[PDB]
Write an enzyme that holds these catalytic residues in place. Sequence first.
Site, PDB file in Angstrom:
ATOM      1  CG  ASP A  50       0.835  -2.162  -1.198  1.00 31.47           C
ATOM      2  OD1 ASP A  50       0.361  -3.125  -2.466  1.00 31.47           O
ATOM      3  OD2 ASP A  50       1.498  -2.706  -1.060  1.00 31.47           O
ATOM      4  CB  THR A  83      -1.480  -8.994  -2.684  1.00 36.23           C
ATOM      5  OG1 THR A  83      -2.069  -7.164  -3.207  1.00 36.23           O
ATOM      6  CG2 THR A  83      -0.550  -8.775  -2.104  1.00 36.23           C
ATOM      7  CB  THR A  84      -4.086  -5.766  -7.119  1.00 40.80           C
ATOM      8  OG1 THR A  84      -2.236  -5.995  -7.054  1.00 40.80           O
ATOM      9  CG2 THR A  84      -4.205  -4.898  -5.650  1.00 40.80           C
ATOM     10  CG  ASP A 365       8.746   3.373  -7.813  1.00 42.11           C
ATOM     11  OD1 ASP A 365       9.745   3.923  -7.043  1.00 42.11           O
ATOM     12  OD2 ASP A 365       7.242   3.666  -8.326  1.00 42.11           O
TER      13      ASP A 365
HETATM   14  N1  LIG Z   1       4.298   1.842 -16.312  1.00 43.34           N
HETATM   15  C1  LIG Z   1       3.868   1.268 -16.500  1.00 43.34           C
HETATM   16  N2  LIG Z   1       3.208   1.148 -17.608  1.00 43.34           N
HETATM   17  C2  LIG Z   1       2.073   0.217 -17.703  1.00 43.34           C
HETATM   18  N3  LIG Z   1       1.535  -0.563 -16.413  1.00 43.34           N
HETATM   19  C3  LIG Z   1       2.865  -0.589 -15.741  1.00 43.34           C
HETATM   20  C4  LIG Z   1       3.664   0.580 -15.126  1.00 43.34           C
HETATM   21  N4  LIG Z   1       4.544  -0.053 -14.263  1.00 43.34           N
HETATM   22  C5  LIG Z   1       3.448  -0.303 -13.981  1.00 43.34           C
HETATM   23  N5  LIG Z   1       2.638  -1.930 -14.930  1.00 43.34           N
HETATM   24  C6  LIG Z   1       1.840  -2.544 -14.286  1.00 43.34           C
HETATM   25  O1  LIG Z   1       1.524  -2.426 -12.570  1.00 43.34           O
HETATM   26  C7  LIG Z   1       1.405  -3.734 -12.859  1.00 43.34           C
HETATM   27  C8  LIG Z   1       2.023  -4.424 -11.331  1.00 43.34           C
HETATM   28  O2  LIG Z   1       0.992  -3.869 -10.283  1.00 43.34           O
HETATM   29  P1  LIG Z   1       1.164  -4.641  -8.724  1.00 43.34           P
HETATM   30  O3  LIG Z   1       2.037  -4.396  -8.107  1.00 43.34           O
HETATM   31  O4  LIG Z   1       0.776  -5.847  -9.091  1.00 43.34           O
HETATM   32  O5  LIG Z   1       0.802  -3.657  -8.088  1.00 43.34           O
HETATM   33  P2  LIG Z   1      -0.034  -3.743  -6.073  1.00 43.34           P
HETATM   34  O6  LIG Z   1       1.143  -2.754  -6.033  1.00 43.34           O
HETATM   35  O7  LIG Z   1      -1.532  -2.999  -5.774  1.00 43.34           O
HETATM   36  O8  LIG Z   1      -0.464  -5.378  -6.442  1.00 43.34           O
HETATM   37  C9  LIG Z   1       2.061  -5.127 -13.596  1.00 43.34           C
HETATM   38  O9  LIG Z   1       1.585  -6.565 -14.245  1.00 43.34           O
HETATM   39  C10 LIG Z   1       2.762  -3.940 -14.500  1.00 43.34           C
HETATM   40  O10 LIG Z   1       1.986  -4.160 -15.798  1.00 43.34           O
END
Ligand SMILES: Nc1ncnc2c1ncn2[C@@H]1O[C@H](COP(=O)(O)OP(=O)(O)O)[C@@H](O)[C@H]1O
Lengths: 499, 535, 526
Positions: A50, A83-84, A365
């Site tokens: 994360d 956040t990312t 998740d």
């Molecule tokens: N199975 C999947 N295929 C393609 N993209 C995905 C999939 N699952 C999640 N995502 C992408 O991940 C992103 C969310 O990531 P995020 O939660 O922001 O990461 P972090 O928690 O590191 O900030 C979404 O914009 C989505 O498009």
Amino acid sequence: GTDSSQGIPQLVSNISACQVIAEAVRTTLGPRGMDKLIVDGRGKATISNDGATILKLLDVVHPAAKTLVDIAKSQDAEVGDGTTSVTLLAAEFLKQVKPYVEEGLHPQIIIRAFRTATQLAVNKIKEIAVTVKKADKVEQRKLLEKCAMTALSSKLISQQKAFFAKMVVDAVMMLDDLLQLKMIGIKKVQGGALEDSQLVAGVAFKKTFSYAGFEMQPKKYHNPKIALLNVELELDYQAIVDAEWNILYDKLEKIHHSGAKVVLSKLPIGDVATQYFADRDMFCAGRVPEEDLKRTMMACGGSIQTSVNALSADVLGRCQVFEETQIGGERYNFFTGCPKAKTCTFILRGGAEQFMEETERSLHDAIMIVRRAIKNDSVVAGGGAIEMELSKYLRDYSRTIPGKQQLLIGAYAKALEIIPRQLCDNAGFDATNILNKLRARHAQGGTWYGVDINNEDIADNFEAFVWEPAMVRINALTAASEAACLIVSVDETIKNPRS
Amino acid sequence: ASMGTLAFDEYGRPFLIIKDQDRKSRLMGLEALKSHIMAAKAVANTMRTSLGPNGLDKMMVDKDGDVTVTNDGATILSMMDVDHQIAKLMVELSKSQDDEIGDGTTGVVVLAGALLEEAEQLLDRGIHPIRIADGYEQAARVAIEHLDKISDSVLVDIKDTEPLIQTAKTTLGSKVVNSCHRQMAEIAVNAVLTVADMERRDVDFELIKVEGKVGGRLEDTKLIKGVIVDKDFSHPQMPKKVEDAKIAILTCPFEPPKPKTKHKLDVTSVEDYKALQKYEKEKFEEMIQQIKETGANLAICQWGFDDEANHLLLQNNLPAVRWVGGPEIELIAIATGGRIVPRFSELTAEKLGFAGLVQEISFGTTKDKMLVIEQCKNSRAVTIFIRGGNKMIIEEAKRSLHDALCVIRNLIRDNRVVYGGGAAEISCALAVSQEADKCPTLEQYAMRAFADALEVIPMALSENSGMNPIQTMTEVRARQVKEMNPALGIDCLHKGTNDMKQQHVIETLIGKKQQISLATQMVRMILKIDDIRKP
Amino acid sequence: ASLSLAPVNIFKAGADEERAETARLTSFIGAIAIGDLVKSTLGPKGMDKILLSSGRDASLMVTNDGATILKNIGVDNPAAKVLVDMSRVQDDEVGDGTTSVTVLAAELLREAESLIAKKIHPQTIIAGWREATKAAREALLSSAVDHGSDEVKFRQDLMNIAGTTLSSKLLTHHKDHFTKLAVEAVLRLKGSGNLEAIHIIKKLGGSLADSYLDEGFLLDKKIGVNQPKRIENAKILIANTGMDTDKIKIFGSRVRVDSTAKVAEIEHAEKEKMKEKVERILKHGINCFINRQLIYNYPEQLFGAAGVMAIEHADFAGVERLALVTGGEIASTFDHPELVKLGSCKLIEEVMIGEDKLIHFSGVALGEACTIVLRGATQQILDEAERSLHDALCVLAQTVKDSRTVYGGGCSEMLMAHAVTQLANRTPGKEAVAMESYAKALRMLPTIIADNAGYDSADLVAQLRAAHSEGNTTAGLDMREGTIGDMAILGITESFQVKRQVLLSAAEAAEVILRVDNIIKAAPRK
Ligand SMILES: Nc1ncnc2c1ncn2[C@@H]1O[C@H](COP(=O)(O)OP(=O)(O)O)[C@@H](O)[C@H]1O
Ligand SMILES: Nc1ncnc2c1ncn2[C@@H]1O[C@H](COP(=O)(O)OP(=O)(O)O)[C@@H](O)[C@H]1O
Ligand SMILES: Nc1ncnc2c1ncn2[C@@H]1O[C@H](COP(=O)(O)OP(=O)(O)O)[C@@H](O)[C@H]1O
């Protein structure tokens, strides 16, 4: 020995610091995103995919970096984990306005254009957002189950994954009170098949050398409740030794008179005195974890005792039943059977010792994805599809605005493109061709084609059931735009040391 | 390359961004992964030569200068100067493997090094680590099912020693101690079977302490069922032999107590001084009488006592010792059933220990003697007192006994065993090759990569002695395709056949199962690291 | 994939670890250095060695025994530390042969690196060395002889063994007298291994031939002022009593008075308590008193008035040995005159040797101690004399414990040489070559033994080889003529146990050293 703190030099320094901060956490975006072990300097290496946790453990001294991190933390505590995404988007804004502030574009023009483009995007997103809540979500939950599928797609655990999704979704219907992170927890169990994981309406905590007193508790007890005691119970000569014996005798008499099935003492309870302390005739324990307590006052209301012979009505109050069975050959300690047991724990039953991280990334998740799907109604295709649509809108509207805002809105549209770029980067595919195909298809063919993590090709992520709350995206984009505006609005840094 | 980007500005005016990047270092992705896997080369190819019966020992010295020669891979890598974080992660990989298995430390490190090296020349072909991690997980499950194909079980009875002796002998053959092979096999069996619990529980290492000092011969090794202390009697004139020693546990000095509170006492007259003297004398006599009350034949102190108490104890013919540490007193009490006596008033008849036989042994012209109790009826401690050429052969014997105890514990807590010696790993290579043949090409690359990497065990086994690797491989899998057996491996000592069953080469299946699993998972999670930002 | 040519490395500031072959080079050159520093002290023609610390202290040692030589030396090779350890182990076991085992190990490592250059692996070397050690032990067992049952034969063997042991030392001139003295002391110990019961004085002046084993003792303490200077047939009393600045152990009491009369009364109290303590001392019926601590003016004045000798500053070991040999006891409470044991003495006087006064003691009761006067010219020749005497006593005690003996002086050495030679000739493989290098080092030990005198090596090797070929397990070299002889007749006899321990320890240390391949060095602290 280079000093640079003038207005434009300070602006470029601040936004370069933001660029470095983004570069630090570029590659952790997405479900298949990689990570880094960071040691705090005390010998404790840390792994957490994360991005928010990475920034939390990260420490940077630049004031611009500090402001960006603070905005990221503020976004983290509000909704989801963006956040990312927001940090990358703001950093892209800054790095694409580099070639604009580098020659004389006044910051206020940029601020105004960014506000205008943010309003344009937040208004143009509502014409594309599609609501699915009425499409058989509360009942006939196939769509919500497919949403659960999308969080764990393309894995051999699919046979177990279907049951786990039905597990979490039923837990959602019987806990549909806007579930949070702490309301639901998990506990680790060694051995057993992966399919053997099953939901219990309570908690699990294995008893250790300093946890419980003795075995063969009355599991089938009608009203067992947690009783917490802040008095020691474990085991000049005729002045303190006889006093110790008297204290032990009166504490044993208090335990016998109280009749509480479960008794917790503040000092550790040693297992070497199991035969010595088996005469209590009811279960006694000690060194209760704070998490276990926090999961029990809201369960059925365990009480706390604070006197030498303290007795309360909730030492033996009304809770349904107690569970204590052999889990993997060792008997656990379940504080189950509670009328308000608003805490469902997924028993991590698997044969892999190092499966805890995969469970955390694979079970936390699903509950979050279904909770965000339920909470909001309007959704848009994910995987960069909405980002590409917004980029196309802003690029095609920038050429329609006569004035200095044109180039600024164009750069804003160009900077909204990193989400597919970063996703395909973390997927390992070459970014150029996939982004090219996605952009061409999105501009010409369809308005919802997004990245695919499984087959690694452009696809209509709307059909792939890649959902995301419209309001969450709206507020994340608004926060990123506000962060960019604030960081552009800097002119001078004042320190004025007291020393 | 050097100094990153050399512009110093975008137009030509003075400007600077990175603070002293000339002497810094920036790594992004592939270069960082190369640094990690080069560290993996360092650790693995340092570790490799201690593998198999022809596995030589190592000399490693820290900045302090400690002399250490060992043969158990975790022991070699335990205190070596670890600088790079992933190397340290491999170090606690070996530490964890030793903690929860106790054998096969050499295998995990070499296997991980081979996997990581083959992964780097995979990356040299331009492939992203996620695919390699997935292929390695597939290889892991293939290897696990292949191990499950030819598993076997043993007896978990306390009286069983002969297969236990064979397994311990096979484990210890690779060490220097193989001169007294069967002797120390029997010694380890006796030590483990002296105290043991069959309720699927562990044996505390705080209860068992094994030590030995220089002198004697290797064949003199035996099992001591008692507590050993490197202390002598308080008064040398007192005869060293005491029988029916009622151990009187004492943990307080023979000095008057004094509170920690800031207090001042004033003496103004002869009467006060005389009364203080009389009180001190009477209290000392009271202490002597209290000691004499129980009539114990052994009193053990903690912080020692003065000369007056020494003469008082000598005049009473009461055996005693001084300068005995707290842990030693606790061990004596728990082995002999004694209690704790923190002060004079707690000296009672129910707080004393007993020893079956107390003996003092002298090797001659050494000027230092030792006292050891033994033959305890309900002893809670066991030990081995080895004699040898010098300190480090004794230390190697200690580590060999530790490894033997570990392998016996593995055999006890689970009966499932297999045979190795190059057999199981070559069978795994054949299996992984088969699934690679029936694998899609993109991940078949990683399949064959993992096979090639896991074929490193016979590589090191052959190069530690000298036989050919490849004709050995050919003969082995020819015999394995002719007939399947978990003991078709390498004839290290020219026994004539490649059948480990005839040569009784036995190792627990759990150890090598966890070997493969831990290697796979940590190789993957190292593949999930590609960034370094050294300032 | 090594560090011979690598673009990148992992090292600390100043750290540079070194590869296996050069590890062997460094460790073996350190072993060669240790052997060279311990060699040249073998055989009757052994040459003494001096020590000089690299610092300004310059610790100076003069001794013919290599164990003390290797005790004080800076160590940088860990293999050198291994060698020092095994030599110290041999020294703790027995007195003689420590230099023999050390030089055996050094030459074994020399032949080991020679074999490494000869393109052979260490494991085969270790296997061959184990087989050869087994064969050599068998051959040594073949000619073992024990004569401890007969007291006269045992005394003759003790004479021969102590003479052989002291021949390698400087005392060879008076070897016969020294051997007789050692036999007398050992038989006066009644077979006890109590080395602390033996003390030898280091007094300056005189000739080494004047040395003798006096039955009594010597006191280095001083006679009091008022105390009598001569007390005969007294009673030996040993005390732990401080009786100096005597105060209660309670530190929580202080003098807070309002008049000096209180302080004067207190001082009168301590002087009265001193008088009571002196009366308690005197009521035991004593005339000679031994104390560990100092004595003030009032106790010595009272003793001189009481006519009782007082001895101060006598350490615990000395008084304990005196009680063991005489019959006294160490005391701390003087309210029990009947519960304190006293010794019996016959002669106590003063002797003047040169310009120093010594309190002479004689007429022991039990005689379970050994004291020898030494008229050393200098301090270092003295130190050599005590070292040689201690080695002789230790080897005599070991022969007492185990009376099995063999014939050495190169004769036994060539016996092992012959045994390993036949073993090598009766088996093929590099194992035979390795153990032939083994045997060659074994034979090279007498090379140093005889070249400490400048005698021929190869001719004597061939002569002893032929003699052992006819079966003469008693044919060894004689330093007087450089020819063969009967070690039984010539008196050169060696303990079987000592020699077997030396051989086994050398083989074990060599095996330990050969099993190390790579040496890694961390960052140096300097
Ligand atoms: N199975 C999947 N295929 C393609 N993209 C995905 C999939 N699952 C999640 N995502 C992408 O991940 C992103 C969310 O990531 P995020 O939660 O922001 O990461 P972090 O928690 O590191 O900030 C979404 O914009 C989505 O498009
Ligand atoms: N006599 C033997 N013959 C063949 N292989 C052996 C023999 N002894 C040990 N091995 C092999 O050596 C490997 C490692 O042993 P070693 O390095 O001595 O201890 P550890 O098992 O703790 O690493 C084992 O996998 C085993 O197969
Ligand atoms: N008269 C002799 N003839 C031949 N060899 C002798 C004679 N005397 C002593 N030696 C040998 O010389 C060796 C050296 O003895 P010494 O220096 O006293 O102790 P260390 O054996 O420890 O060096 C002895 O091992 C002994 O075997």
